[PDB]
Amino acid sequence: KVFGRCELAAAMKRHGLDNYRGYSLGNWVCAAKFESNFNTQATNRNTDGSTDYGILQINSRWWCNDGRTPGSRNLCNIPCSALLSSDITASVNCAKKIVSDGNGMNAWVAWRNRCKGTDVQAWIRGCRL
């Protein structure tokens, strides 16, 4: 599923991401835009052989099991394919674990490079929340 901007913002807000660990909604929407272009089916392979999955590009090196990343962990306790669902619940619940791990949203490279320190409220502007 390819989300619209405001559609995703409302889904995220409903799933408890607004101000989660102090990150306003615009941060999460911005991250999703640059990580996946709002496509829940996005996958991207890393150099180390791990793979990023879904709207928030969650890495199989640490967070999910894809059966093909030897010596990895499964900290979110889910198959990585669950992160590609049109239902964002699993991605959001795993994101909450990631963002609480000490390093905040800096875990997401695109957020650090493209959202951090910008006017992220522009990402929810006009939306019916």
Sequence ranges of the binding site: 101
Q: Which of residues 14-73 bind Na ion (CB under 5 A)?
A: 65, 72
Q: Report the C-alpha gap between 88 and 57 in whole angstroms.
A: 12
Which one of the listed residues 7, 18, 48, 52 is annotated catalytic?
52
The C-alpha atoms of residue 74 and residue 87 are separated, in whole angstroms, by 20
Q: Select from Na ion, Cl ion, none the partner in contact with residue 72, using the beta carbon and a kind-dependent cut-off of 5 to 8 Å.
A: Na ion
Query: Nearest residue by C-beta to Cl ion?
Result: 104
Q: Which of 35, 66, 87, 119 is catalytic?
A: 35
Q: Which does 65 bind (CB under 5 to 8 A by kind): Cl ion, Na ion, none?
A: Na ion
- Give the C-alpha distances (Å, rounded to integers) separating 109 from 58, 70, 115: 11, 23, 10
52 given a catalytic annotation: yes
Q: Which amino acid is at 114?
A: R
Catalytic residue annotation: 35, 52
